[PDB]
Amino acid sequence: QWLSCTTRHVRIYAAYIDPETNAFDQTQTDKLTLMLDPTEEFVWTDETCQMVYNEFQDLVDHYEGAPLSEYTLRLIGSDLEHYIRKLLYDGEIKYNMRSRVLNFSMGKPRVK
Amino acid sequence: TVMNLIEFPLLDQTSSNSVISTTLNDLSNWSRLSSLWPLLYGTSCCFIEFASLIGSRFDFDRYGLVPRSSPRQADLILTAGTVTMKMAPSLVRLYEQMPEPKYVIAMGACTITGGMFSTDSYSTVRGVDKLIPVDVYLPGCPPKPEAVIDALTKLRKKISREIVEDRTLSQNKKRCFTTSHKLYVRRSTHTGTY
Amino acid sequence: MMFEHVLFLSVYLFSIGIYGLITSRNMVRALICLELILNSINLNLVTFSDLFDSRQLKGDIFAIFVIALAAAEAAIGLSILSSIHRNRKSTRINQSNLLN
Amino acid sequence: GRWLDDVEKHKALAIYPPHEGGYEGRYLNRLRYQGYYFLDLSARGLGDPESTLTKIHPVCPPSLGRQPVARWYFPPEVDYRLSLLHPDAKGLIVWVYEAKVSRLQVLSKAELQFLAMLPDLRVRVIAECGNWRKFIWKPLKQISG
Amino acid sequence: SKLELLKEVYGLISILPILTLLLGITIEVLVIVWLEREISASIQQRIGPEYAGPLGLLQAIADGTKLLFKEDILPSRGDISLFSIGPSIAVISVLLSFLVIPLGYHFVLADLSIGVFLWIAISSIAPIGLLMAGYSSNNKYSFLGGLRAAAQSISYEIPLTFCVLAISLLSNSLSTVDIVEAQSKYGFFGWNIWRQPIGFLVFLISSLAECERLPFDLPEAEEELVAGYQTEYSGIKYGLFYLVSYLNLLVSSLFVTVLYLGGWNFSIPYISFFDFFQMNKAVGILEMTMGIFITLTKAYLFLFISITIRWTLPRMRMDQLLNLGWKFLLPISLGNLLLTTSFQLV
Amino acid sequence: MDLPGPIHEILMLFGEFILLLGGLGVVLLTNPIYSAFSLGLVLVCISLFYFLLNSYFVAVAQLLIYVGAINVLIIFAVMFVNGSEWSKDKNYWTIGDGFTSLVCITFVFSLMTTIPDTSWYGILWTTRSNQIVEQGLINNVQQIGIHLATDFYLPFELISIILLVSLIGAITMARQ
Amino acid sequence: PMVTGFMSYGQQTIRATRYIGQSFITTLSHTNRLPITIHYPYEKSITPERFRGRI
Amino acid sequence: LHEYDIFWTFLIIASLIPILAFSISGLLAPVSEGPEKLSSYESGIEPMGGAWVQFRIRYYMFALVFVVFDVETVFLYPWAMSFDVLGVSVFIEALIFVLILVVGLVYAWRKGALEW
Amino acid sequence: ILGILPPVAAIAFFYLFVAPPIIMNWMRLRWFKRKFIETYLQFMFTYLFFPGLMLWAPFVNFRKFPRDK
């Protein structure tokens, strides 16, 4: 069923959920939706996420020929966990900046 | 020449609230921290001493720590024992399926980094915060049976550091994206028969 | 409006009790509506034994007996439901006309 | 503002609470509405605290078993946090949580005196140390030396 | 004139004593949860809910206030159509029972000659709410988790009835006050628990499973699936279920002591507490507080007995529980009535 | 015994409006378990009607023997009918829906116009000796208590064997 | 038969009671025992001279 | 049997109690939890699907025998109240009554009805 | 009607003044070495003087107490 790689900030859902509630948690699993970091570890302006949305087709259509297995889900999440690292290593995106614990998965800032 | 600077504080954070409307939530969060309940979870090399926290050596139940074996009820879960790649895709479901005043922490040095499982192995996950946002990281493999109570006392203050306007930072939005697939389905592999 | 408004609701239940009976499709719904009709008649009965006949209650005893027989019938009908669902693996009432 | 009675004027103090913390958070709640914004540190771990509050100090990251010299040259946390602070802010309220008992550099009382000057010269710092059941506060500079 | 109604607008009802009963029952809930969390987990253990002040006297209401917010979740399958409707029946079934329960000399809330009958009738409405709640969701661990309890509860009211009737036929009444009236004769000889201990045994053993004792056999073993039909019920829902459980316990203790023991009678008959002094001056508040005193302690004794029994027997499985409730308690709970018939024949 | 006052008709209308919606839920909703729960609601709100009128036993018993045993039995029964969510939209079934909703309304009209022509408050005056006795000093659990066994001896002796036969038949039928 | 049941129904109950009351009066000295378990967090355990903490 | 006005006031108050508590919870609550929220407690990742989990075959017999054996009590109560008031005839009548259902219970016991 | 206040005031104040701060001392003095029925002594009193026992329950206030003018 809905066996998706639901890692932090990487939830490639193998089932249609883009309502407030999927009403079945899967909606028969025919769309393969995705939500980006509900914990707000990164604040998003549309333009910044537009490159990720564009390369989503590069990851779902350009290099996909294997059946619906989490093998492909790791094949996606691997580059997904480094596209954000690249987008931050060049300063285009920044961290949460809210009243949460403000954890640093990639460590504190640097001086280049 | 700073790398990965922090975002600017957008609000000016300038406000003033009445005491008769603030002390209510103040004592409410005081109760919320002084009535926390554990959630049962424990796997491996950094767990077993949790059991001793219920006896005559260590007794954290003295503070009202009611151990609940259910996600939707409790709010405090201890990721005791070193976690691997698997048992995680169902672990995060627990954090997703409990009320919002969770304020989860960690336990076991092999869960903040993966200490004794960090030379070469395709099973162990490097830390837990790369799966779930928690607050405090607890060292020790096995974790010191007293350090956990001290870290609970530490976290006991963060909730007391909350105000009435803070009860809006748990509301969510939806970055729900409309993207489909084109691939072939796989039938269920975990066939339950003998 | 005690003595007058309640009876105005007896029919307004009895009728419904019959309708759900006729338009019923599953056995359990038909039995529910049957019980509903019996309760309608019970209610139409009791009020009569409160306005008058207070020396020796002649309605409340009859209401008790009606409730007892209603419970007995609701037991027996469900018992028959067990056996029918054992024989055929569906209890669709209106799809069994092999006796005509 | 009972804390305000001994923070704006002194700018140097230490919190002596009971060893549970279940009575002190209310105090921290009130100091978000003047220009004071929280910086918790848990001082244990850093070397000479000067280069931790003024200078670009290389914080050696937790090593991964291999990789000889690799230190990301981390920055200080005073002037940058001022740059993120608005021009409408009274002071930087800071908590030296690991100030106690009852090439590193022991954060002794001399180091606290040298952390009592950044409040005055160029952060409203408060030391932490558990004490008697009644939540008390005391100027640590006189305790310092 | 008297156009519609002169003195009949709203000034015929006062809601003071009802709210006093509410405050009292809430305080007693705090007391009983303190009893549990300070005696059960302290037999050979550490102290109970310390650090909530001196002792856990504030811990109970602290847990209540914490459960108050707790962001009620309302799962998807099943909704307000039956979810919020579930625990309401549960809480009302035991809250309304507080009507006919007395506390002392002339402190009953309603004479209600059908009192104990009303209590027995209201005790057999909870299973409806339990089945509704357990089915208000869709997944397992709540459907069967509630089905088990709703089923096994049904297997016990018959001994309850055949033990309450074996006392109604002794007191020749159905109102609690007259029951304790027929029992204040010999101080403690005339107490029904000595006249009919065979009925008291059945009532006491049934009371355990009737107030969900035990719903889970072990501190680690669940309530037979993962939990007792209260898994998704997170905030005030689980709070109300905790309440209704403790309140069933309380009503059972109060009823067994008001039936088989002297309700507000001393060890010496209740009327005799006035005659031996030849005069009384201010016995009003004395007798009021002493009725709250000599009565609540007797039920406290059974609270403690149940607390102790909690850690002495492995509560049976629902393969033995039905057997015990049906083929064991029913025959003797009928035979005691068959005996007391000829016993009260005189 | 008697009732408070002009609060009476308030509770009367309230209970009537509750019971109407209850019956409509019994008869309309397709999901049978919702129907059974609405039936339970109907029966408790009619037990309250029984209690309002000063007849106490036939109220509390009706609450115990129906709102208890019968409803939980029916709930157990609905665990044997599979397949729900039939059609909908304004008489989901065939024209038989309309034919019923016609003939039932004719039945209503007939009885509902027969009733408001009999002066019930005038049929109460002609009997001023029936409810004028009370036997001298009795309460209303002893009225039934005695008048069930002093003259209703035969049906009380009878009902028991009916119960026994029903039990035997139910066990012999339900068991395979 | 029933005479064997009329003889053993008291035996089952007497065994149940001989076990229940025995365990009850035995755990009586446990519910009100005189042991003192772990004290507050200000009463940490003693540590002999072979362990490992912060190197 | 004089004034159930206290009963009615207690009914309305204790029926307002649950909706009052629910509404009070709702007022001071979080407008949050837009997560999955479509699956319930202690579940294998998203387990979903399944039916025909009844085992009504066993418990139905218990329910039936209970429903039949219950009616005894609401007939005994008017008798249990009117023992001394009347003579001893009601004693024999109720003995016949109860003995009928004792025989019924004996039958239900012998032939396997009350089982595992 | 004049001298009625001292009697009903002194006993009603003692009913809620002395027991609250001393129940916590009698329970803290012995908690693990009690007898089989000793815990029954002060626990019952936990209700009787309750008019004031809750006033010295953890409700004990730590307000800032505006000082002498």
Side-chain angles (χ1 to χ4, degrees), chain A residues 2-11 13-16 19 21 23 32-36 38-63 65-79 81-112, chain B residues 1-3 5-53 55-59 61-75 77-83 85-86 88-89 91 93-111 113-137 139-143 145-160 162-163 165-185 187-194, chain C residues 5-10 12 14-39 41-54 56-86 89-100, chain D residues 1 3-38 40-43 45-79 81-99 103 105-116 118-122 124-145, chain E residues 11-31 33-44 47-76 78-111 113-140 142-163 165-180 182-194 196-201 203-212 215-216 218-222 224 226-230 232-269 271-316 318-342 344-346, chain F residues 3-15 17-18 21-57 59-63 65-66 68-78 83 87 94-117 119-122 125 128-129 136 138-149 151-174 176, chain G residues 1-31 35 41-42 44-48 50 52-53 55, chain H residues 1 3 6-16 18-30 34-35 44 47 49-51 53-55 57 59-63 65-66 69-110 112-116, chain I residues 1-28 31 34-43 45-49 51-63 65-69:
Chain A
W2 182 23
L3 302 193
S4 306
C5 173
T6 69
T7 320
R8 198 211 182 105
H9 56 265
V10 184
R11 304 154 160 90
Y13 283 175
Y16 175 40
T21 57
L32 169 77
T33 191
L34 296 84
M35 45 194 59
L36 279 72
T39 187
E40 300 102 7
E41 181 93 356
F42 301 128
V43 192
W44 278 128
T45 294
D46 305 66
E47 65 180 1
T48 42
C49 188
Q50 289 299 339
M51 298 143 267
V52 176
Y53 202 75
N54 294 148
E55 67 89 33
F56 188 88
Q57 289 301 316
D58 198 271
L59 57 89
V60 65
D61 287 26
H62 272 175
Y63 304 107
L68 257 62
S69 77
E70 306 89 20
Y71 211 66
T72 81
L73 287 185
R74 170 65 170 155
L75 184 52
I76 298 305
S78 296
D79 191 30
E81 286 196 32
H82 296 71
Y83 202 93
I84 319 173
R85 178 161 179 246
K86 283 171 167 294
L87 197 45
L88 71 87
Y89 187 45
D90 308 278
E92 291 93 15
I93 56 175
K94 286 88 72 175
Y95 292 175
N96 173 28
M97 266 290 303
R98 261 156 164 149
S99 278
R100 265 143 168 77
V101 74
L102 279 163
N103 57 5
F104 287 76
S105 72
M106 274 73 77
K108 276 162 276 291
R110 298 188 253 260
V111 300
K112 310 187 158 212
Chain B
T1 310
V2 63
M3 186 67 252
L5 65 88
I6 324 172
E7 278 162 357
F8 206 84
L10 58 100
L11 309 159
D12 272 348
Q13 283 102 9
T14 295
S15 44
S16 312
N17 303 6
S18 66
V19 185
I20 70 150
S21 158
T22 302
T23 42
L24 322 172
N25 160 271
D26 188 306
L27 292 201
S28 316
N29 311 337
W30 156 84
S31 168
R32 189 178 72 163
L33 56 90
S34 159
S35 296
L36 73 173
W37 306 342
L39 169 52
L40 190 150
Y41 170 79
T43 50
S44 86
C45 77
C46 313
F47 167 68
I48 206 77
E49 280 288 344
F50 164 65
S52 48
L53 311 178
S56 173
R57 211 71 157 188
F58 291 81
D59 186 288
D61 295 332
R62 189 171 67 258
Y63 317 91
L65 277 292
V66 192
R68 320 306 301 251
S69 173
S70 87
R72 292 279 204 214
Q73 293 185 210
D75 55 356
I77 186 169
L78 273 296
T79 49
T82 315
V83 297
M85 164 59 163
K86 306 324 294 175
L91 190 151
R93 184 84 51 185
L94 297 205
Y95 185 87
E96 308 147 9
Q97 291 225 327
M98 67 160 52
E100 51 83 19
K102 338 173 179 70
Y103 307 95
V104 181
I105 50 184
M107 174 196 157
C110 298
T111 75
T113 64
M116 53 77 57
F117 282 142
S118 288
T119 304
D120 51 335
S121 67
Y122 43 73
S123 78
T124 303
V125 175
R126 280 77 208 160
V128 290
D129 58 29
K130 82 172 259 191
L131 266 293
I132 295 194
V134 308
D135 188 305
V136 178
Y137 301 164
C141 172
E146 181 49 48
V148 59
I149 282 169
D150 286 280
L152 259 63
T153 300
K154 296 167 178 57
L155 174 84
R156 203 181 148 93
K157 307 173 265 276
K158 165 136 168 161
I159 303 317
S160 84
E162 294 286 293
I163 66 163
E165 310 177 300
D166 276 353
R167 276 206 84 242
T168 321
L169 314 171
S170 316
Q171 315 204 301
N172 46 283
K173 268 69 64 180
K174 43 175 169 183
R175 314 171 168 104
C176 61
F177 287 177
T178 187
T179 58
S180 167
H181 54 264
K182 59 102 176 177
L183 268 172
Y184 165 58
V185 77
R187 200 58 258 172
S188 277
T189 303
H190 55 81
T191 61
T193 187
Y194 211 82
Chain C
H5 178 34
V6 165
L7 302 156
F8 277 165
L9 184 135
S10 174
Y12 276 164
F14 181 93
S15 177
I16 284 171
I18 323 295
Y19 162 57
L21 189 45
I22 294 195
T23 196
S24 196
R25 262 82 67 85
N26 303 293
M27 178 70 200
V28 307
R29 172 157 300 174
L31 215 47
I32 285 187
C33 312
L34 187 52
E35 296 300 321
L36 192 53
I37 312 171
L38 274 71
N39 292 117
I41 291 159
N42 200 354
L43 168 57
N44 181 277
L45 162 75
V46 173
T47 80
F48 278 153
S49 168
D50 190 16
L51 301 189
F52 51 90
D53 262 342
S54 294
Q56 42 189 352
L57 278 301
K58 293 146 169 294
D60 287 331
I61 303 176
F62 186 67
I64 286 184
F65 289 150
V66 165
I67 295 169
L69 295 184
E73 270 166 319
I76 279 176
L78 285 189
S79 201
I80 298 313
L81 184 57
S82 177
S83 293
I84 174 184
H85 179 273
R86 177 70 29 81
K89 311 260 161 274
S90 293
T91 79
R92 172 74 66 79
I93 288 312
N94 281 329
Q95 283 308 112
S96 309
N97 63 308
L98 56 87
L99 182 58
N100 71 283
Chain D
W3 193 353
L4 274 298
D5 302 336
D6 288 329
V7 54
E8 204 150 338
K9 47 167 73 173
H10 272 304
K11 312 181 77 167
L13 177 135
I15 279 157
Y16 280 177
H19 304 240
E20 293 170 32
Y23 311 90
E24 59 87 21
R26 188 263 329 277
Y27 297 100
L28 185 58
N29 302 343
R30 319 272 71 88
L31 272 296
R32 297 193 182 165
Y33 319 122
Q34 310 295 322
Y36 283 21
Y37 295 90
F38 44 92
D40 186 75
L41 271 291
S42 290
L46 271 166
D48 43 352
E50 306 165 6
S51 179
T52 77
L53 281 197
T54 189
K55 279 143 184 46
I56 179 169
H57 47 277
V59 164
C60 45
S63 280
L64 290 168
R66 301 138 183 80
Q67 277 82 241
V69 290
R71 300 160 263 166
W72 292 129
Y73 294 3
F74 285 78
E77 51 265 33
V78 160
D79 195 288
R81 280 71 198 171
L82 205 64
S83 74
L84 267 64
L85 271 160
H86 287 94
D88 169 70
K90 299 189 182 314
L92 284 75
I93 194 65
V94 194
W95 276 4
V96 174
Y97 174 59
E98 287 302 322
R103 185 66 76 188
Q105 295 300 307
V106 170
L107 282 79
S108 67
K109 281 310 225 165
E111 281 56 37
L112 270 302
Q113 299 183 352
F114 300 151
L115 255 64
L118 215 52
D120 213 36
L121 269 43
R122 286 172 174 254
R124 272 79 150 165
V125 287
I126 306 293
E128 295 204 49
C129 165
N131 199 357
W132 316 308
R133 58 171 302 273
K134 209 60 203 175
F135 171 82
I136 311 308
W137 51 63
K138 264 160 193 188
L140 78 163
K141 288 179 69 69
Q142 273 313 118
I143 301 174
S144 315
Chain E
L12 302 197
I13 296 297
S14 282
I15 60 178
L16 273 296
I18 304 101
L19 200 143
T20 74
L21 315 172
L22 262 56
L23 298 200
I25 62 170
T26 51
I27 294 168
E28 288 300 328
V29 165
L30 318 173
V31 186
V33 61
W34 200 95
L35 255 68
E36 206 59 270
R37 305 301 316 282
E38 289 269 8
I39 296 155
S40 276
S42 88
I43 44 172
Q44 173 66 277
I47 193 163
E50 213 186 10
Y51 286 64
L55 319 170
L57 312 96
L58 208 49
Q59 183 64 257
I61 185 155
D63 316 313
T65 58
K66 186 196 87 170
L67 286 153
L68 190 43
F69 314 100
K70 277 297 265 197
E71 190 41 33
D72 288 2
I73 183 77
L74 310 95
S76 78
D79 57 336
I80 308 168
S81 52
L82 272 191
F83 210 98
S84 178
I85 320 295
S88 199
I89 301 305
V91 63
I92 191 74
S93 44
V94 67
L95 268 193
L96 199 81
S97 48
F98 287 157
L99 276 164
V100 298
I101 279 183
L103 281 182
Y105 192 72
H106 291 283
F107 200 63
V108 58
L109 268 300
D111 310 336
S113 78
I114 62 171
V116 289
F117 189 21
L118 190 150
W119 158 56
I120 305 163
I122 208 61
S123 46
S124 160
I125 317 299
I128 283 300
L130 318 173
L131 260 174
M132 160 171 39
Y135 197 74
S136 279
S137 159
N138 173 69
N139 78 330
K140 279 74 195 164
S142 44
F143 153 67
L144 168 67
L147 193 140
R148 56 98 178 172
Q152 57 83 52
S153 297
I154 302 314
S155 48
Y156 268 88
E157 297 87 350
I158 292 292
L160 275 72
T161 298
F162 284 110
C163 305
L165 192 145
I167 316 302
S168 197
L169 197 63
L170 269 291
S171 158
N172 263 326
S173 177
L174 281 172
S175 157
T176 63
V177 190
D178 314 280
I179 316 291
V180 312
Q183 208 168 353
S184 279
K185 175 190 277 297
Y186 292 144
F188 86 98
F189 315 125
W191 286 18
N192 292 318
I193 205 172
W194 321 79
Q196 284 304 270
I198 184 163
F200 152 68
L201 280 178
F203 197 54
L204 190 48
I205 181 173
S206 83
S207 47
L208 313 163
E210 278 288 76
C211 56
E212 272 173 348
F216 54 106
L218 289 148
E220 208 294 310
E222 76 277 1
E224 188 177 0
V226 185
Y229 58 79
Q230 57 195 359
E232 64 277 25
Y233 291 67
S234 66
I236 72 162
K237 276 85 157 160
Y238 165 73
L240 287 200
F241 279 156
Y242 207 64
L243 266 291
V244 73
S245 53
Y246 278 162
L247 311 169
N248 307 316
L249 192 138
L250 301 159
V251 302
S252 179
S253 44
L254 264 67
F255 271 107
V256 64
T257 178
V258 78
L259 284 155
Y260 286 85
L261 317 174
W264 55 83
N265 185 8
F266 209 63
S267 315
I268 300 313
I271 297 171
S272 59
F273 187 74
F274 326 121
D275 302 78
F276 76 96
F277 204 50
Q278 321 164 60
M279 64 182 180
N280 312 334
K281 197 270 282 182
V283 78
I285 186 74
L286 173 148
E287 184 41 57
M288 183 59 225
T289 302
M290 271 286 304
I292 302 176
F293 187 94
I294 205 61
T295 291
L296 191 145
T297 58
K298 309 193 179 81
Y300 182 98
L301 192 150
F302 276 43
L303 309 192
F304 202 64
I305 279 188
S306 88
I307 287 177
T308 44
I309 291 179
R310 167 99 189 264
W311 316 123
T312 52
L313 281 170
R315 188 74 197 171
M316 309 150 297
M318 197 179 71
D319 200 342
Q320 168 68 259
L321 175 56
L322 289 171
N323 190 0
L324 163 72
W326 274 117
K327 284 186 200 204
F328 179 93
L329 277 193
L330 187 39
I332 51 186
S333 48
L334 293 188
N336 75 333
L337 161 62
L338 313 182
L339 167 65
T340 199
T341 43
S342 186
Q344 195 69 281
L345 193 139
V346 183
Chain F
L3 320 166
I7 304 168
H8 195 204
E9 65 272 27
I10 313 170
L11 284 179
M12 271 300 192
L13 275 293
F14 182 33
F17 191 62
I18 301 284
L21 196 167
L24 276 194
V26 162
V27 72
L28 255 68
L29 316 180
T30 61
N31 195 3
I33 298 167
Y34 290 145
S35 79
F37 280 131
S38 78
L39 168 83
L41 161 73
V42 168
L43 270 297
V44 56
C45 71
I46 196 180
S47 166
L48 268 296
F49 270 47
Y50 277 164
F51 185 82
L52 177 56
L53 298 146
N54 260 344
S55 169
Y56 284 70
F57 197 90
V60 51
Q62 192 266 7
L63 180 140
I65 299 314
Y66 200 102
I70 284 171
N71 283 320
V72 287
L73 184 46
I74 291 172
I75 293 313
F76 270 100
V78 189
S87 85
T94 79
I95 198 60
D97 294 334
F99 282 119
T100 57
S101 65
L102 164 78
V103 288
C104 294
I105 290 316
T106 73
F107 186 98
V108 176
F109 164 61
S110 44
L111 279 189
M112 199 36 76
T113 198
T114 294
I115 288 176
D117 288 311
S119 65
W120 309 109
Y121 280 26
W125 312 139
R128 70 217 296 281
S129 89
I138 309 280
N139 79 330
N140 188 17
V141 68
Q142 275 179 337
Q143 292 285 72
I144 293 181
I146 286 98
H147 289 177
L148 185 39
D151 58 353
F152 281 99
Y153 173 38
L154 173 70
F156 168 58
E157 183 174 306
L158 200 152
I159 182 73
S160 66
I161 65 169
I162 281 184
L163 279 194
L164 156 66
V165 172
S166 45
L167 180 147
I168 290 189
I171 293 173
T172 46
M173 279 283 187
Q176 53 269 9
Chain G
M2 182 58 210
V3 65
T4 173
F6 212 69
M7 174 72 117
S8 198
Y9 79 94
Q11 308 324 297
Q12 296 175 300
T13 60
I14 211 68
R15 285 186 293 277
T17 305
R18 179 144 294 111
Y19 283 150
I20 282 155
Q22 207 163 358
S23 200
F24 173 47
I25 315 180
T26 300
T27 322
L28 188 69
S29 159
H30 289 214
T31 61
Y42 311 148
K44 62 166 308 307
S45 178
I46 180 64
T47 53
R50 191 71 171 182
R52 260 197 273 273
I55 321 295
Chain H
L1 275 177
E3 192 70 359
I6 175 60
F7 165 92
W8 284 108
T9 314
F10 201 92
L11 163 66
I12 177 180
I13 286 184
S15 65
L16 169 140
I19 177 63
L20 185 143
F22 270 85
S23 291
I24 285 295
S25 61
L27 305 193
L28 200 171
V53 186
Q54 81 297 5
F55 211 64
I57 306 103
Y59 305 81
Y60 176 67
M61 315 282 164
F62 293 68
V65 59
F66 158 82
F69 214 68
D70 204 317
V71 189
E72 207 159 1
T73 80
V74 306
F75 277 49
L76 286 201
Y77 284 161
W79 165 83
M81 173 55 58
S82 78
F83 190 69
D84 167 54
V85 189
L86 274 175
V88 300
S89 60
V90 300
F91 153 78
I92 288 170
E93 305 188 359
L95 264 289
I96 285 171
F97 186 83
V98 292
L99 262 292
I100 287 303
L101 296 178
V102 184
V103 171
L105 160 78
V106 168
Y107 164 63
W109 184 14
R110 290 238 63 198
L114 323 168
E115 309 313 306
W116 82 99
Chain I
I1 64 153
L2 189 150
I4 190 174
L5 192 83
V8 292
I11 183 65
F13 290 164
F14 152 78
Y15 206 58
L16 60 90
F17 259 60
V18 70
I22 192 64
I23 51 183
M24 182 272 259
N25 213 316
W26 285 110
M27 291 298 91
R28 210 154 280 171
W31 179 252
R34 76 275 190 194
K35 203 206 66 64
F36 303 105
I37 209 71
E38 196 265 350
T39 186
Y40 184 83
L41 277 72
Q42 200 67 259
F43 278 39
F45 285 173
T46 304
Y47 156 74
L48 184 145
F49 300 103
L53 308 184
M54 193 76 105
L55 317 175
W56 290 94
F59 155 82
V60 187
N61 219 354
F62 313 102
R63 291 268 176 85
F65 281 19
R67 289 56 161 181
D68 293 17
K69 323 184 296 172

